[PDB]
Design a protein around this nucleic acid. Structure first.
Lengths: 314, 452, 516, 416
RNA sequence: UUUUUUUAAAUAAUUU
RNA sequence: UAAUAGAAUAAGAUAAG
């Protein structure tokens, strides 16, 4: 077609169509023979496979990049001048146009710069490939959480794969990145060590969510979904909260029991979840996996513009 | 780059933008400029109005939306300090805010429109064209401002104060706004007359295109343009020949002695035509109505070689033109249907319905194309006319599509526009076909409205 | 190393668990700026938490400059921060002090807002009678800095200030004079009365008062030359012991007013060059320009001032290279060493020079003999080819003329310059000529280019003189123009002066008379 | 059967109908009391009780809309009247900010949901746009969707006359202090129905014809599709009141329809008035000046040009003789009337001149003495020149006053 | 190549 | 406790009412 002279430098309507990654945060991706620098130690992989989660030794982003990424989150929940490309999100907490004390966004990698760049970050993608038995890494989807000051709620105990039942094999990993300093008083993760090998790699029954109640009861709902032996290993190794810095990341298994604390600080707290999947991932039904996405059929290999390949060890 | 002040950043961003838009669209420069602009802030430093305007324009030019920090800072500066945006930097701000569609952008555009309306008597040759082009980028309906700018343009053109570039920019800007002024365009045409040899081939074709698009219905200047361009055909490029065909299809007057020469020149450069040029030539021949199989065979043979280069617009226009003329090219139609099925999500509201109707009119049914466009049809129902909805429904019925998730949007749209749906006589036959397939069971209210 | 108590305090600050007021944030920032033993600026996660506390605090309690200092110390560490804008006082809050505070915050924190300025002026109009004499001068200064266009309100304030002549001191009088001089739209009657006030109390002036009055006189222009007269005589008894910057301002005023009494100008220049070594880069540049504009650059004068400017020539500002290059020319004095280092400095910063500065530098260096055998010609040719898109008609003419005079040969650049100049027509023969000089170096151009060039030339031939006619004919024959209209126009212009084909007429002119 | 969800814009009746009926009756009683006044305290007591009842009704409606899925099950006419009442009760100061925003956010959400399905008819888009932009409620997606949907001119082809008049009146009344960002979209509402107005040109009544013309001209819009609309007015003069003729003259001047033949009828109809005012006199002078500049001394009828100038001058004298009855509100009116009189060499009796110059004296005296309260220096110079030209014996006080005003410097400059 | 420009305008009607 | 300024510069096709 003819792109007008003042529209030649524009970008696609949704950043899904942007093949590759823009150079905004860390420039361009390294060369094919330059991907060996971001490899992680085998002890980190062993710790992930033993505990069900692991904290990467080094922060993944510089402070200026974290500031820019937090500005993207701050502008993704404007509620006055709503974000451009808001329709390019799988879900939003502001669909009601009011929001609340908790802001959650999904599929923001198609809406803002930096967030689209964060998907192709080598530091986390190489580690995800190593976790996934050195295979192709494909984005599953994104998620952004923002809890307000003095009133932010807490997300109770949950299993990630319990929301991904339409994907056949368990071949997933979660990377959670703290865009702000976190603690037990503001959005720190609370994971159960060794909880990904409890029900023979199965899924625990969903927890009962009763809002408008204190955080202690919300975090104490664990004793209602476990059985006697799981009670014993919970007695032996109680849930542990991980303190995260301004850029530190955390790898989480899909089957690991996981919750987030509430926000009692004087400022909002932000975090970003990115879900990755391997090459050998299939669907179970006929239809789309996400709202307004490419539809697959039967046991169809999950691929397309909505699930880009972010790393290839070949 | 850290040692460079923001006044130098604006200059280098403008340099990068100028190199990008004109001297080839190198992605290297685009991504370097995007990376440089992504880490810039107008905070704590005193800056000129021109520097802020340049930063805003170069940021917005490189795909930066209204949620950016630099864009927000530049937009805020303009609002707080408005009088600092003189007529020299008004077009920059208007061009930057044209694509930005937000409350602050709307307010800024309105304030600059009023400023340009007040100061329309004091502009010179550069300012009038720059302002009118910048306001032609944005979609505005301030007729009074356009009339004042046209009066100033006529006053300046009486003393002969416009070059060929100024003339083409003015004509394009005024034809984009659909501002039909017989005297303004007569003055522009007479200024081209007076300029004479200073208007080259590269600067004459866009003038003819802009004069054809506005539609003045004046046969006195169309003949003159044909005569003036008849000597420049041998120098014309393929992209210029296609634009010439399109412009003189827009005019609507038949010039056989010119169309023959244009056809010969197009045949000479058949190896240089892309998909866009083929689609433009076919659409121009469809509009003007001449049926020339000899050029059509060459155009179809060329289009069979550049199938992978075809865009959704090109596919729609080429298929519609080939269907109108009753030309049978089974291989080309199969390849185009497969390609359209490949890029079904790029179709806009008009293109999807045009492609579906053109494929359904000819006895050509392909499940790869049919399923893809039927599924895509859901997202464009809300942007269609009553006649377009009727055409889309007939094409969907010819595909034998019965999925309720597809049929409910189109039936809702045709029910909301039922008066215009049933008031078009030329589609009456199509109506008695649509209800012949679906029957009274599907959407009873539409059937009852059809009976009445 | 942070001990347990310090570590826990730092953690509480990092987690936004401590409610900080603006005063406490200011104290912490002052401590960090004064003593770096704890490494506060070396912890990004601590300074970011302090900034987050700063945003969510009540900043109205602290002075505007305290908020500006917090913002500056956050910017220095790498955090993008800006103090909040103050709201316009409402209902009972309108008092003179509260309204002056809004302008002061707009000044110090660089958050200028025309709408709030207008609202403050409308609120301050009714209560203008409650202002103390000092607050009126503060308002005049604040409005002068903000580049306000409401000259009527500033005139009212000036009248009220001048009603209190006895109360005001010399410093206040000088500040009011310079602030009024900076405002563009002040009625000349108020300026005349203020200058009359300044004329008296002349001996009470201090060096800062002299500098302020000289700045005001420089801004005002020659119409106040009489007042400047009362300056010069008043400065005649103190010239032998005076500040260097004051003498530079004196020379600038002498250049601006076009002073006629040469004895005082010579006295001031001779006193200036004694202490010219104490001047900064900008002051030295302005003094060097002023001495040139007054025809006072003798051999000793130029040598002494060039010896001083060579010191700053090593790291000269890009805005200062072109002026001293201009002063180096148009004088019959040796300046080889100055021009060498100036050309080297221009080479160093070739990638940051704007289009106008590059064109100017090339224009001055066009006719310089030692500039041809330099890398600068080639580097500037590439830079000009890059920057042709950002060049106006004047920059185009300057750059093309400078490159053509230097012997720079590049057909593509000259063709691109001609095409760029075809986009906006050449108003003058001086603008059009450099394109012809550049294109005549290669001796060939497309027929369309020479055809458009002739179309441009033919109208212009009705005013050019005989020398310009000969030069245009030379360029036209070099480019190979076959159009008859242009040659007919040039021959018609020639006939006006000659009226006949003189036998002695240069052989080149007879060919023109045949209208080839 | 297909699960279509298209309900008529103007059956499927929910409790929203009853709530809107209660609100309608309350507003009707309040407006009836408002008419009845023309016991203020007892009146305002009943107004307060009705306001409390309406606030309770709206609170119940908002709670029902929040808790239950009522909007999806509701019709569409009920949604339109709910939007109307939510926007209207805010201008009447019967609702708070929080409740108004809560009620409008869900209305916009439901409107966007119905837009996604495509059931938004060609009339409901115009209705929602007019009742959202005039209330100055900003939603980015809603505004962008409406603006993009207002460019499909083929949809807005068979709009009813009542809808056109109601939307035009709604846009016209709230024009005075509308926000700038709301202007452009307002114009896109007017141009969407411009052809319906043009084909409805021979159907409007005379009072509403001028209303449409003023609504279009006040939004700096003079579309060609409304060209017959003006022409009929030019061919229907004499049925207008004398005051309306001034606005008709201004409109016809802005539509490039103002010729010599209509000027005579317009000025005669102006002079048929019982007593002139500043508006009729100013419009008449502007029309006379405009028709005075349309004569060419070297055209086809160059020999006929001077008689036309004499006719224009005499009919200007007709107005000029009646220049003492009017009351000038501001100096620019005087400086325009006197400029027209001097430029066209119109003769004015000394009595009218004395009254005119007496009126301006009080104004300049107010400006000079009060000094607290915008006569610029150039306007004062023009007034001084006018007084000197006509003679200083007319107003000897004004000459000294204005000369002292220049000496003191009270009058500001045009630059400031 | 000779068309035209310069107000503070505020009077529609409705259950949306 | 905190206040100093410089530059003058033009790109150009949306399947319409």
């Amino acid at each position: 077609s003819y792109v007008l002279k003042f529209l030649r430098g524009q970008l696609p309507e949704d950043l899904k169509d942007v093949n590759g990654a823009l150079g905004c945060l860390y420039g361009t991706l390294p060369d094919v023979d330059e991907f060996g620098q971001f490899v992680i130690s085998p002890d980190v992989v062993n710790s992930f496979h033993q505990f069900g989660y692991v904290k990467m030794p080094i922060p993944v982003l510089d402070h200026q990049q974290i500031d820019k990424l937090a500005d993207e989150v701050n502008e993704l929940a404007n509620n006055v001048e709503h974000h451009p490309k808001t329709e390019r999100l799988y879900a939003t907490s502001l669909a009601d146009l009011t929001g609340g004390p908790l802001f959650f966004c999904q599929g923001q990698w198609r809406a803002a710069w930096g967030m689209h760049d964060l998907i192709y970050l080598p530091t986390i993608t190489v580690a995800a490939s190593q976790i996934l038995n050195n295979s192709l890494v494909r984005l599953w989807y994104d998620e952004v959480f923002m809890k307000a000051a003095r009133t932010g709620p807490c997300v109770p105990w949950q299993q990630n794969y319990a929301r991904w039942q339409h994907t056949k094999p368990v071949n997933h990993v979660t990377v959670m990145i703290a865009l702000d300093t976190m603690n037990k008083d503001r959005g720190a993760p609370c994971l159960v060590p060794g909880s990904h090998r409890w029900r023979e790699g199965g899924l625990l029954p969903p927890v009962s969510y009763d809002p408008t109640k204190d955080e202690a009861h919300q975090l104490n709902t664990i004793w209602e979904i476990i059985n006697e032996e799981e009670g014993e290993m919970l007695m032996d190794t109680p849930p542990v909260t991980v303190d995260l810095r301004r850029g530190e990341a955390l790898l989480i298994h899909p089957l690991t029991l996981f919750a987030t604390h509430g926000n009692r600080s004087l400022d909002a707290v932000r975090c970003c979840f990115i879900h990755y999947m391997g090459e050998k991932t299939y669907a179970v039904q006929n239809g789309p996996l996400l709202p307004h996405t490419t539809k697959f059929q039967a046991d169809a290999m999950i691929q397309g513009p909505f699930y880009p390949v972010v790393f290839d060890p070949a | 780059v850290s040692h460079l002040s923001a006044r130098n950043i604006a200059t280098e961003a403008l340099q990068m933008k100028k190199l990008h838009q004109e001297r080839g669209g190198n992605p290297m420069l685009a991504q370097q400029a995007r990376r440089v602009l992504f880490a810039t802030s107008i905070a704590g430093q005193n800056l000129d109005a021109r520097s802020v305007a340049l930063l805003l324009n170069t940021a917005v030019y490189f795909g930066m939306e209204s949620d950016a920090k630099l864009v927000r800072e530049c937009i805020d500066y303009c609002l707080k300090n408005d009088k600092l945006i003189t007529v020299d930097v008004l077009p920059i701000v208007v061009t930057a805010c044209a694509t930005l569609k937000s409350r602050d952008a709307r307010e800024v555009i309105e304030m600059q429109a009023q400023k340009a309306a007040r100061n329309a008597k004091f502009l010179d040759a550069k300012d009038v064209t720059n302002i009118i082009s910048a306001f032609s980028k944005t979609g505005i309906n301030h007729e009074k401002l356009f009339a004042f700018l046209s009066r100033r343009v006529q006053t300046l053109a009486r003393v002969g104060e416009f070059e060929a570039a100024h003339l083409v920019i003015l004509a394009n800007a005024f034809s984009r706004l659909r501002y039909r002024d017989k005297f303004l365009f007569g003055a522009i045409a007479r200024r081209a007359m007076s300029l004479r040899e200073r208007v080259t081939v590269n600067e004459l074709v866009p003038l003819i295109v802009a004069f054809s698009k506005i539609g003045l219905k004046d046969p006195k200047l169309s003949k003159r343009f044909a005569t003036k361009a008849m000597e420049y055909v041998d120098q014309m490029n393929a992209e210029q020949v296609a634009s010439m065909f399109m412009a003189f299809a827009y005019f609507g007057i038949r010039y056989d002695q010119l169309f023959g020469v244009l056809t010969n020149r197009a045949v000479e450069l058949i190896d240089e035509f892309n998909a866009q040029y083929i689609s433009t030539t076919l659409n121009a021949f469809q509009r003007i109505g001449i049926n020339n199989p000899e050029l059509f065979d060459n155009l179809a043979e060329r289009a069979l070689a550049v199938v992978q280069d075809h865009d959704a617009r090109d596919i729609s226009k080429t298929v519609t033109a080939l269907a109108h003329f009753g030309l049978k090219d089974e291989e080309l139609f199969k390849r185009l249907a497969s390609h359209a099925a490949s890029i079904a999500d790029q179709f806009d509201a008009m293109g999807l319905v045009n492609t579906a109707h053109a494929f359904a009119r000819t006895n050509f049914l392909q499940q790869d194309m049919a399923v893809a466009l039927s599924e895509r049809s859901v997202y464009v129902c809300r942007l269609l006319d009553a006649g377009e909805t009727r055409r889309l429904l007939w094409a969907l019925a010819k595909f034998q599509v019965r999925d309720p998730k597809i049929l409910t949007p189109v039936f809702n749209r045709c029910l909301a526009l039922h008066y215009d749906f049933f008031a078009d006589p030329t589609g009456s036959e199509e109506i008695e076909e649509i209800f012949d397939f679906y029957g009274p069971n599907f959407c009873p209210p539409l059937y009852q409205l059809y009976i009445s | 190393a942070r001990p347990s108590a310090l570590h826990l305090i730092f953690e509480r600050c990092k987690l936004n668990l401590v409610e900080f007021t603006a005063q406490d944030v200011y104290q912490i920032c002052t401590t960090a700026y004064n003593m770096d033993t704890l490494g506060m600026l070396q912890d990004p996660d601590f300074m970011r938490g302090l900034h987050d506390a700063f945003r969510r605090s009540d900043q109205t309690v602290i002075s505007p400059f305290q908020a500006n200092l917090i913002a500056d110390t956050f910017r220095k560490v790498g955090i993008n921060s800006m103090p909040k804008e103050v709201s316009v006082p409402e209902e009972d809050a309108i008092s003179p002090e509260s309204l002056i505070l809004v302008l002061r915050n707009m000044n110090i924190t660089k958050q200028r807002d025309e709408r709030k300025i207008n609202e403050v002026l409308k609120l301050m109009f009714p209560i203008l009678d409650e202002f103390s004499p000092t607050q009126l001068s503060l308002t005049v200064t604040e409005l002068a800095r903000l580049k306000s266009t409401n000259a009527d309100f500033v005139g009212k304030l000036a009248k009220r200030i001048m009603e209190y002549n006895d109360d005001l001191s010399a410093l206040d009088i000088s500040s009011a004079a310079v602030s009024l001089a900076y405002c563009p739209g002040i009625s000349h009657n108020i300026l005349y009365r203020m200058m009359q006030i300044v004329e008296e109390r002349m001996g009470e002036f201090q060096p800062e008062d002299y500098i302020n009055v000289l700045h005001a006189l420089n801004t005002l222009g020659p119409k106040f030359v009489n007042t400047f007269r009362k300056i010069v005589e008043c400065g005649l008894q103190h010239v032998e012991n005076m500040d260097a910057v004051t003498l530079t301002n004196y020379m600038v005023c002498f250049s601006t007013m076009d002073y006629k009494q040469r004895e005082h100008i010579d006295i001031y220049a001779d006193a200036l060059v004694e202490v010219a070594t104490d001047l900064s880069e900008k002051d030295l540049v302005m003094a060097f320009i002023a001495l040139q504009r007054l025809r006072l650059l003798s051999d000793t004068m130029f040598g002494t001032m060039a010896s001083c400017v060579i010191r700053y020539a090593a790291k000269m500002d890009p805005r200062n290279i072109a002026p001293i290059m201009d002063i180096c020319s148009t004088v019959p004095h040796a300046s080889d060493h100055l021009m060498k280092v100036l050309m080297d400095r221009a080479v160093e910063c070739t990638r940051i020079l704007t289009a106008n500065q590059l064109g100017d530098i090339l224009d001055i260096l066009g006719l310089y003999p030692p500039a041809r055998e330099h890398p600068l010609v080639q580097l500037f040719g590439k830079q000009a080819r890059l920057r042709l898109d950002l060049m106006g008609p004047d920059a185009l003419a300057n750059a093309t003329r400078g490159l053509a005079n230097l012997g720079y040969a590049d057909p593509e650049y000259y063709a691109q310059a001609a095409e760029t100049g075809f986009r906006y027509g050449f108003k003058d023969w001086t603008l059009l000529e450099p394109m012809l000089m550049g294109l005549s170096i290669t001796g060939q151009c497309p027929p369309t280019m020479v055809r458009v060039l002739g179309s441009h030339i033919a109208p212009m031939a009705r005013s050019m003189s005989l020398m310009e006619i000969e030069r245009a004919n030379r360029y036209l024959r070099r480019l190979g123009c076959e159009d008859d209209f242009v040659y007919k126009a040039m021959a018609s212009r020639v006939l006006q002066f000659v009226k006949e084909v003189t036998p002695e007429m240069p052989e080149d002119l007879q060919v023109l008379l045949q209208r080839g | 059967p297909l699960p279509v969800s298209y309900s008529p814009g103007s059956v499927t009746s929910t409790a929203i109908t009853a709530h809107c009926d209660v609100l309608s009756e309350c507003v009707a009683k309040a407006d009836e009391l408002a008419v009845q006044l023309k016991t203020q305290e007892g009146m305002e007591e009943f107004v307060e009780e009705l306001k409390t009842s309406a606030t309770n009704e709206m609170t119940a409606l908002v709670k029902q809309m929040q808790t239950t899925p009522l909007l999806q099950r509701a019709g569409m006419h009920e949604l339109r009247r709910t939007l109307y009442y939510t926007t209207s009760l805010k201008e009447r100061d019967w609702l708070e900010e929080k409740q108004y925003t809560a009620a409008m956010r869900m209305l916009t959400v439901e409107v966007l949901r119905r837009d996604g399905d495509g059931v938004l008819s060609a009339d409901d888009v115009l209705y929602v746009t007019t009742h959202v932009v005039t209330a100055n409620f900003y939603n980015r997606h809603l505004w962008n969707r409406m603006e993009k949907s207002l460019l499909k001119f083929s949809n807005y082809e068979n709009i009813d006359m009542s809808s056109v008049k109601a939307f035009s009146t709604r846009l016209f009344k709230t024009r005075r202090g509308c926000a700038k960002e709301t202007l452009d979209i307002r114009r896109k509402v007017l141009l969407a129905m411009s052809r319906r107005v043009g084909v409805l040109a021979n159907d409007f009544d005379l009072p509403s014809l001028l209303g449409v013309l003023q609504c279009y001209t006040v939004h700096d819009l003079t579309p060609f599709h409304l060209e017959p609309l003006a022409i009929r007015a030019t061919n229907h003069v004499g049925d207008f009141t004398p005051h309306e003729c001034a606005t008709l003259a201004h409109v016809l001047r802005k539509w490039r329809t103002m010729r010599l033949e209509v000027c005579e009828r317009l000025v005669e109809r102006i002079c048929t008035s019982d007593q002139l005012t500043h508006h009729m006199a100013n419009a008449a002078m502007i029309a006379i000046r405009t028709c005075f500049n349309q004569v060419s001394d070297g055209g086809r009828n160059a020999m006929n040009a001077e008689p036309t100038r004499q006719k224009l001058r005499a009919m200007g004298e007709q107005i000029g003789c009646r220049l003492d009855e009017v009351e000038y509100p501001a100096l620019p009116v005087i400086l325009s009337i006197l400029d027209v009189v001097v430029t066209l060499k119109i003769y004015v009796p000394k009595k009218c001149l004395q009254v005119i110059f007496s009126q301006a004296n009080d104004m300049v005296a107010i400006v000079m003495e009060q000094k607290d309260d915008p006569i610029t220096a150039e306007e004062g110079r023009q007034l001084q020149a006018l007084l000197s030209h006509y003679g200083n014996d007319l107003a000897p006080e004004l000459s000294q006053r204005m000369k002292e005003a220049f000496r003191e410097g009270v009058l500001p400059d045009e630059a400031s």
